[PDB]
Amino acid sequence: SNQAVKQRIRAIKNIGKITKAMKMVAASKMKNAQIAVEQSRGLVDPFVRLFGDFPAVNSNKSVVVAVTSDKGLCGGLNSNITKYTRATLATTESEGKDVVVVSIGDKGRSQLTRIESQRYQLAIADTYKVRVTFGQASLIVEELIKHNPQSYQILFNKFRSAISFKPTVATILSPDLLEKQLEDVTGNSLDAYDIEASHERSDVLRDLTEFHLGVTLYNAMLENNCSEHASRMSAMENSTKSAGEMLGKLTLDYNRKRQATITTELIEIIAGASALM
Amino acid sequence: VGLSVSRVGSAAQFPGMKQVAGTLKLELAQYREVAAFAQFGSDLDAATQYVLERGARLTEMLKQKQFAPIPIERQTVAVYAATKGFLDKVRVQDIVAAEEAVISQVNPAVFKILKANGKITPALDAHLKAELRKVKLPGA
Amino acid sequence: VGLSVSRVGSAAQFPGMKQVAGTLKLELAQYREVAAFAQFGSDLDAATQYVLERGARLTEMLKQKQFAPIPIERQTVAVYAATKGFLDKVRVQDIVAAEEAVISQVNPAVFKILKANGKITPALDAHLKAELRKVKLPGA
Amino acid sequence: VGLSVSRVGSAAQFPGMKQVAGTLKLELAQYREVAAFAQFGSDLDAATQYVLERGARLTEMLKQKQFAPIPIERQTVAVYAATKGFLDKVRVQDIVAAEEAVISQVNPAVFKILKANGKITPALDAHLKAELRKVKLPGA
Amino acid sequence: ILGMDELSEEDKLTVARARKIQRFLSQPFQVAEVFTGTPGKYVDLADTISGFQGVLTGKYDDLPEMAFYMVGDIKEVKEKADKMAKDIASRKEADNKKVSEELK
Amino acid sequence: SIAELGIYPAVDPLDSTSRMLNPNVIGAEHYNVARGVQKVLQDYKNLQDIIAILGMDELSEEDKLTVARARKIQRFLSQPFQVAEVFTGTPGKYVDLADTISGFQGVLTGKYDDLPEMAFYMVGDIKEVKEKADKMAKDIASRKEADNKKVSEELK
Amino acid sequence: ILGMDELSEEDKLTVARARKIQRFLSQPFQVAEVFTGTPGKYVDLADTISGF
Amino acid sequence: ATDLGGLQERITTTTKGSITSVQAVYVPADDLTDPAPATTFAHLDATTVLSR
Amino acid sequence: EAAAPAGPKEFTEVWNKKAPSTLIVPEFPSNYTAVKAVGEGQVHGDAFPVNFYTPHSILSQAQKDTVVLPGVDGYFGVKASHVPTIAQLKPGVVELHSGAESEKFFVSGGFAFVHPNGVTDICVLEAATLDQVDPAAVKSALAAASAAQPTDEFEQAANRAAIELYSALESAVEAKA
Fold this sequence. Notes:
- The structure is cut from a larger assembly and holds one copy of chain A, three copies of chain B, four copies of chain E and one copy of chain I.
- Chain A is α/β, with parallel strands linked by helices.
- Chain A is 55% helix and 14% strand.
- The longest helix of chain A is centred in the last third of the chain and has 37 residues, at 238-274.
- Chain I is 21% helix and 24% strand.
- Chain I has helices spanning 10-15, 137-145, 153-174; strands spanning 48-53, 63-64, 66-70, 75-78, 85-88, 93-97, 102-107, 111-114, 120-123, 127-129.
- Chain I has two domains: 37-133, no CATH class; 134-173, no CATH class.
- By secondary structure, chain I is of the alpha+beta class.
- Chains in contact: A-B, A-D, A-E, A-F, A-G, A-H, A-I, B-F, C-E, C-F, D-E.
- Chains A and I meet through helix 2, helix 3, helix 4, strand 5 and strand 6 of A and helix 1 and strand 5 of I.
């Protein structure tokens, strides 16, 4: 059994090298994918100061997006936003609201089915396989447009720094189905604008809502990707500290057993020599 | 290399090997810090990839072939060619034949100067350096 | 069973179980590696989940009570009922109670012929597999 | 403190120290528990932060200098000033200054009453609450 | 190594229920009350089997872990689970109308 | 550890050595195949610490080629013995030396990378690999035909 | 894993102070001056205390 | 312990002079709990760790 | 008409009544910006703030005095106290004016808001500065797009976008001074 302790020391030592390398891999992938999040944080603002921000809307039909990670050493991010998805898919319900449950990421389909399997409809995965592009987020938004809901619900982690990641609920209102109706405040604040588009307001708010869905989805799955990287970077420095503490304790144990087996073998040799001497 | 020591040290090393093995052992130590991290290939650092690709150059450089002992000028020309960077063209699986394609390609008039002087003199450090660029390495 | 051996081989296995339990220890060999990897639960393959599902049917099959030795023919039917698929889609928490259905609700005449021949004859290979569907299983 | 045990001296220790030290061992157990639960700094719950600060307050209280043993009456009071309030203003660094501030500034007859009685009577609890409010704490 | 955050849902269930029954096997002793302060709790056998059966079936997943720690049976589990909750409100309001004036 | 995976004869390919593994007694086409098999199998045994926790998805498809090549070589090193027909199921195979060297030189250099890994398990030489491969393909294309009869009313 | 100019100003002041204390613990030796050229320095105790 | 303390107890300060020992220490199996350094370290009044 | 009084302040308090108290209130994207539409100010005289965005880049975020914007009716201009407008944009050239200098961004088509407080938001999709464009490939791609006229309205709309984009880009790279 004294080579079981040595092979366990081998195992924990290579694990503590693997996680020390994956911490640096995540720290490399965080620093080049931190600037694309900051370049994306501007474009969400014109639509949020234009369309407003209206989460508690009595939508007849809704689509929820919980955008998660794909690889699963993130350290409780996807479970956190899955709990936020159920905590907002119980909050927004007031009228028997049909909700479409859509998750982007392989670690979203495996948990939102455990939470809500009956209303779960679409699964998008490998959305971080090369990088996040607006054409991809546009195609996902077009697939979310094949459902014609009255609102869209976006659940992502707002990457603040390399430590703080807050889950954010962002909404997108369908143009004439609820968006022009939710601006109707003692009249309307939307009719103060001069529509300069080709056609009427009914197909400039349509184009503008599809664009807002694409922008919110693109910024969501970029910001959540940077939160995934910066949380795996700190969830692989607890693996290195745990594998270092276990290697320290196992090295101490192996030295105790090494000394004990030298003493035991020695006492056996003396006991065998004294029975003849 | 991590455990093989020599308490005499490089005081009893052939000079001309001491000029180039002093950097060979340093880059091999950097590789030994960077080894077992090379299975994460797509996720680069591009500076630890430099010490990774150079250490993988120098590891396959040092292999021999069972009762073919190599004379010391050919050894120091080998770690000159691999250490200075004349073999960054060659992929890691053809450096056992890239060193065979140095000794056969570099003229044998530099080897007796390197054996005789017992160091890489700067005239020779221009000569054999210029001779390693007219070498037909098995590269692609 | 990963460390258990019988060095007589299948020379002295009951022939009605030499053919059924040969593919029992295959699927438990497939079960022993895919279940330690999924102790982490890193990725899913959805067919490796199946051999993790069926191998855990067969672990719950091979459980036994303390002073209840099952003769030989009621052991080969309780493994015919799992290696020919009949106890699939029966809940894993309830295979230790679903197999009293196989001993009771299956005809007592199928054990007298299987003990007499020692091998599942084709007139019994299909006739017993037709009666393993004519049983009431919990969960269903 | 989690491993240090002394059973026979308990229910035979100083009565005032027994009054003020059950909650001392209690809040250090809470401090070791709220340190073992959040071992690395990522989440600030701010309700454990009271325990995580009172524990460091008591831990900085418990440490003392070498070759300077303290009388038990100048020790019951100094741990009264930490298990109760009276030191939650002083940050963590001046507690070794705040302890000698509490000991020097308080009326020295409080120590005589405490040493003679053995326990902190309500007549002594009133003056101990009074004289520990009017001390000039260094964290200010 | 990896923490609880990389466990499955059923394994987080196993870890939570096992931490609860790890605490619930502990009990205060009538002969250890002279140095622990907690009075000793004799537990009947039917109370033990019913309580552990309830923790196993999932009747007490909503309770915290330390409500099971150093209690007699599952009635005292909920007594401490309420008492434990109550102290999460009252941590204050001991400023005036006390017994610590000067003259009385 | 070889034998718990079911590879019988359970020879460790790495720890087993010979004095006939000299290139100037058994030639170069034998020595190079033996050392290349050892190199692939030791590379895979190096890979097994990052395979076992991460799962063969971050390996840049140079290490994945190595894992598939090593698993094919590991299964192909197994051979059903003529004296072990009593144990498992299989008539024994005598594998002549030239067919062994050609087969492992084929698996080593990517000539059989399109064949599945279990067609190499307990087969004699590399044409028995393909013969088990096509047979397995016929087995899977014929597995789904029998679920419509044999449920009642046999032909007496 | 982050870079030189990622950390704060009060911490990099200690990086500079440590990089110039770590240099200041070096000392030329009198018995080294036959194979270095640079002469040796004997440092007094309170001189070391004050200079640090 | 007594064969080590027979040496290391004559290295002390008397009223006449003092003997100060700089003793090279080999930790045997990277093991500080080995009884040769666990007995040696009892007498050691300082350490000077030279590092590569 | 405003029967769902939602917001970044109402969902937090109606979320207190359904979510468990272990979960802190989720954020909303209005929490991360200080500029709004209704709140007055942000003019201080002549220059008004422009917010030029693009998904992958932010080409300008400072203040300008006047913007020339390629609307779908045509290239218009905005002053500081401009009327609230939402403008769909043709493939054209945005010019940001700050004084004598000006930057010439060629965008591919997007929107351009002017908000009721006068803050403007140019939200385009791909925006190349006119220096790094070639006049070579546009002619060949236009000629390849001007001959293939299929029957399907999808590729007809795509080819019409190609004609208009390439025609305006050649027209904006031809007459540059």
